[PDB]
Amino acid sequence: VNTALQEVLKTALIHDGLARGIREAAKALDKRQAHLCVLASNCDEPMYVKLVEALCAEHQINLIKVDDNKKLGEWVGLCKIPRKVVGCSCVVVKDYGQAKDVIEEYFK
């Protein structure tokens, strides 16, 4: 399921539709244009762990949970080629550009 997530985030980078950071993810979430959200599971503070799926369910947005954040960060292009290795905890794909169909009937 990660490879389908990898290709949909790759084509999000191709079309520049995704928003990085919980601030930009939340702004895409609550403005009723988001398509999917991705949350990292390796979090220390639990205040923002539980409210992201509340925002997703309030605006009818699907969510994908990933165990790692640095791998998710280097997949979504937070590294330059890599010397600097940083990773994000949340990212929202607002719009798309085969396996995305697999993702969307995995949601159902």
């Binding site: 980078l13 191709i14 520049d16 292009g77 080629i81």
Partner: peptide, 18 residues
């Protein structure tokens, strides 16, 4: 547009030049 390329060893980003 050119005729030759780097041929093998994969691609990372196609780049949006338009």
């Amino acid at each position: 547009s050119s005729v030759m390329r780097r041929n093998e060893q994969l691609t990372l980003h196609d780049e949006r030049f338009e």
